[PDB]
Design a protein around this ligand. Structure first.
Ligand SMILES: C[C@@H]1CN(c2cc(-c3n[nH]c4ccc(OC5(C)CC5)cc34)ncn2)C[C@H](C)O1
Ligand SMILES: [Cl-]
Ligand SMILES: [Cl-]
Length: 262
């Protein structure tokens, strides 16, 4: 990046920093670049995690360039943009398209969980689409290790995005990482099927969250969602993380296994 790259436009922000669409001044190859003025501990950590990743539903990491204090992180550019931009406000998207994306989401989250990594900020802005509309989970700024040498560590830090965060994260000093990512996937599913988020945060003081706990599914967004995927959302958006559905049991759900698409 001495001046091999032209910064063409802003793609988005992660938890930490900004990512740009960079076009190479020599070959015109277009990539995404995250540019960070060196926290050194965090970016070091982000890089180490980014190097662990290799899966069809995780965004490709090309590498990094340290130049002065500033670190440059290079990634595959998602030619289909983000899932956020496929969700029509107040409508969502067609159910077969939502189910395919949800399958792919689950594949990527199983992969991360399997290498002991939790993402911590799953939401449509961070789920990217390639030229064939395959979903790729991006933005590892909040990702961390939850399992190492086969021993689980609990998480003890609040982070993410409020409409997507699980309730235990707001209430418990320490909590299990996997059920928090499961919960955010359910909020993504809700967005895809209804084009609207159900609550500002899953707290007792938020009426929309109380309404769900009281099973008022004749209200929006729930009323927009067919009974089969709603039944899955009933198992995912369970307040007590120990009673929440796990990914192996999502894979057995009726809707998850319903044939919808070519
Ligand atoms: C319309 C425009 C939208 N687009 C994109 C691409 C990307 C993107 N690619 N790779 C990334 C790697 C990391 C990344 O970290 C986020 C999710 C924090 C923004 C974004 C991208 N993020 C949004 N929009 C691609 C061009 C062709 O089309
Ligand atoms: Cl390990
Ligand atoms: Cl949305």
């Amino acid at each position: 990046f001495v001046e091999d790259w032209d910064l063409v436009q802003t793609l988005g922000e992660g938890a930490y920093g900004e990512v740009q669409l960079a076009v190479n001044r020599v070959t015109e190859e277009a990539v995404a670049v995250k540019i960070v003025d060196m926290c050194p501990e965090n970016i070091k950590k982000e890089i180490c995690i980014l190097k662990m990743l290799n899966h069809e539903n995780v965004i490709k990491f090309y590498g990094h360039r340290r130049e002065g204090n500033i670190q440059y992180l290079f990634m595959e550019l998602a030619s289909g943009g983000s899932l956020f931009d496929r969700i029509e406000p107040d409508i969502g998207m067609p159910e077969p398209d939502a189910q395919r994306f949800f399958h792919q989401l689950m594949a990527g989250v199983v992969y991360l969980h399997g290498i002991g990594i939790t993402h911590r900020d799953i939401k449509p802005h961070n789920l990217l689409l390639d030229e064939r509309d395959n979903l790729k989970i991006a933005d590892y700024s909040l990702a961390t290790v939850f399992r190492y040498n086969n021993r689980e560590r609990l998480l003890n830090k609040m982070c993410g995005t409020l409409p997507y965060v699980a309730p235990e994260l707001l209430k418990r000093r320490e909590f299990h990482a996997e059920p928090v990512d499961v919960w955010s996937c359910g909020i993504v599913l809700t967005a895809m099927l209804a084009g609207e988020l159900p609550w500002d945060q899953p707290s007792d003081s938020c009426q929309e969250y109380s309404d769900w706990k009281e099973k008022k599914t004749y209200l929006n967004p729930w009323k927009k969602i067919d009974s089969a995927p709603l039944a899955l959302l009933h198992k995912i958006l369970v307040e007590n993380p120990s009673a929440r559905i796990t990914i192996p049991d999502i894979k057995k759900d009726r809707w998850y296994n319903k044939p919808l698409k070519k």
